[PDB]
Amino acid sequence: PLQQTGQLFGGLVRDIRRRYPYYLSDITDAFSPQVLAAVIFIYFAALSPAITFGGLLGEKTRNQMGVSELLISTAVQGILFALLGAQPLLVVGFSGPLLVFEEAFFSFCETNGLEYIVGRVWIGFWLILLVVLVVAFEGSFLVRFISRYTQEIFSFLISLIFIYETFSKLIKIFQDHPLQKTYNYNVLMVPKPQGPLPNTALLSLVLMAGTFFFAMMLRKFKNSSYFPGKLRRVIGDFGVPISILIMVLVDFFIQDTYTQKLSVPDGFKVSNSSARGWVIHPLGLRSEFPIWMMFASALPALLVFILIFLESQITTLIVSKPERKMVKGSGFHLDLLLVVGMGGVAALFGMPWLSATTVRSVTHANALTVMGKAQIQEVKEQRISGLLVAVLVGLSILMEPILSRIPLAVLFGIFLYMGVTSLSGIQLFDRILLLFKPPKYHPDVPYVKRVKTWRMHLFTGIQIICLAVLWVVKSTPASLALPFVLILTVPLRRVLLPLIFRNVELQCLDADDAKAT
């Protein structure tokens, strides 16, 4: 999939030739209850980041882009990606790096007297030109140099960041409503409570812990020896929906105590009708857009292209490992074209550009993964689940009476489940656990039986230094430089690691398919 043909758009043509023959199977393979349970899981897993990032974006850009724009962009791009993409298991949505870029660009436009939304339109115009050229010259063949080293470092870092943010949300909940001896019983509740409230933080903790506990218990019950196998596996597939239902019911039957719920906009309208409409004029809304910024938009377009490219291509690498039993093929050129071009077009409507998010896509792949009699047997590779998730995200505004009764704490427990279960296939997480085990308990794997214990521990420790370096970069104002520092790991594996490790050691420790050299 990563070979270079030498023909213009050759990689694009190969990806369509590889995956579109399976299009009929991509509809029939979805006829199973596990696909529906995956739909219900990934619906919340995709809606909650949309609502949170839409709120943050509306706060940080004076609602020039907000919740409604993000929901509509997510729905439309998800529908078009599920209908046309070459790896339908990817989940397309907004991410943290994109939010940071939006903050930086809004600050830049505020400093230079620029219209932020028109600048986004021109960045999107330059994004279309870039992704067409990269796909034309098969630029996605460079993904082959991202080995398991860089992939697993990125995956472990993103999972750790996800878990950290999930816990920080609960910490913020505890800070807003602390445990106090006395409370002001007359507190304004609209739009949000104006002071601390009793029982709120502790009940949020109880809801989050209970949701995580029920999800993990039903995941264990799936592999258990209890009940008939068909009924057991059906309940196990519906583990997350059942956990969400149980905890939402628990919160519903507790009336007096306040908990924060999901809040969607009233209708399909722009977040600021006093600022912009549904179509943004590239020449400007209030003032004339300067000519120099039309060409200077290439540099932010280069940065956004790099961000989306690295995130989406590494996510495609992670979800399409040979050891995950994906027997239908993935298209690196076609998916990149679709994602970046849809983002560039959506910029014209004042809507965010999206990326193939790693935690959401990995969670989607795991929810569709079938476990045999342990060992991965197959994956329900189909387009219906992602299409339904996107459709439900688009319909989220209309189903407010249902979403308004779902607490955020339940979703926090679901996020914790997603974060812990996203670490299963990572060999870096496995080797970190080996640091806390005696060498006689190390598994029979090629990087244990062919590599000395302290050599393997040194290899793992070098990766941890990269993890710390990347974590520091994120927690700095220069957090948009994270893709470049991640890229720097590729020379580290290919130039510096052979200086201290032998070839057989590196083949055992950095193997594309978990092979014994």
Ligand X SMILES: CCCCCCCC(=O)OC[C@H](COP(=O)(O)O[C@@H]1[C@H](O)[C@H](O)[C@@H](OP(=O)(O)O)[C@H](OP(=O)(O)O)[C@H]1O)OC(=O)CCCCCCC
Ligand Y SMILES: *[C@@H]1O[C@H](CO)[C@@H](O[C@@H]2O[C@H](CO)[C@@H](O)[C@H](O)[C@H]2NC(C)=O)[C@H](O)[C@H]1NC(C)=O
Ligand Z SMILES: CC(C)CCC[C@@H](C)[C@H]1CC[C@H]2[C@@H]3CC=C4C[C@@H](O)CC[C@]4(C)[C@H]3CC[C@]12C
**Residue 294 contact, options a copy of itself, ligand X, ligand Z, none, Cβ 5-8 Å cut-off depending on partner type:** ligand Z
Interface positions, 51-90, toward ligand Y (CB under 6 A): 62-63
- Smallest gap from residue 123 Cβ to ligand Y (A): 20
According to CB under 8 A, which residues from 290 to 349 bind another protein?
348
Q: Which is nearer to ligand X, 139 or 236 (CB)?
A: 236
Q: Which residues bind a copy of itself (CB under 8 A)?
A: 178-183, 185, 198-199, 202-203, 205-206, 209, 225-229, 254, 256-257, 433, 436-438, 441
**Shortest Cβ 294–ligand Z spacing (Å):** 4
On whether the CB atoms of residues 222 and 239 are closer than 8 A, the answer is yes
Around Cβ 478, how many Cβ atoms within 10 Å?
Answer: 11
Main-chain phi, psi angles of 355, to 5 degrees: -145, 155
| Residues 123 to 182 in contact with ligand Z, rule: CB under 6 A | 125-126, 129
Residue 63: contacted member of another protein, ligand Z, ligand Y, none (CB under 5 to 8 Å, by partner type): ligand Y
Which one-letter DSSP state was computed for residue 261?
A: B
Which of 253, 436, 499, 513 lies at the binding interface for ligand X (CB under 6 A)? Answer: 436
Closest by Cα among 92, 163, 473 to 319 = 92
Name which position in 286, 291, 436, 499 contacts another protein (CB under 8 A).
Answer: 286
Compute the radius of gyration of the chain from its Cα atoms. 24
Q: Does 458 engage in binding with ligand X (CB under 6 A)?
A: no
Strand 369-371 vs strand 376-379: parallel, antiparallel, or unpaired? antiparallel
Sign of CA pseudo-dihedral 14, 15, 20, 22: positive
Instruction: List the beta strands (DSSP E) in 144-250.
Output: none
Distance, CA of 341 to CA of 352 (rounded, Å): 12
Contact status: 8 vs another protein (CB under 8 A): yes
* Residue 188 makes contact with ligand Z by CB under 6 A: no
In the list 284, 290, 446, 461, the residue contacting another protein (rule: CB under 8 A) is 284
Residue 126: name its binding partner from ligand Z, ligand Y, a copy of itself, none (Cβ under 5 to 8 Å by kind): ligand Z
Q: Which of residues 185-244 bind another protein (CB under 8 A)?
A: none
**Comparison of 208 and 301: residue with beta carbon closer to ligand Z:** 301
Closest Cα to residue 103, out of 46, 146, 42, 53? 53
The single residue listed with the structure tokens 């997603």 is 418
Burial string for 253-283 (b: 16+ CB within 10 Å, else e) reads eeeeebbbebebbeeeebbbeebbeeebeee
Cα separation, 77 vs 55, in Å, equals 20
Given the rule CB under 6 A, which residues bind ligand Y? 62-63, 272, 274-275
Given the rule CB under 6 A, which residues bind ligand Z? 125-126, 129, 291, 294
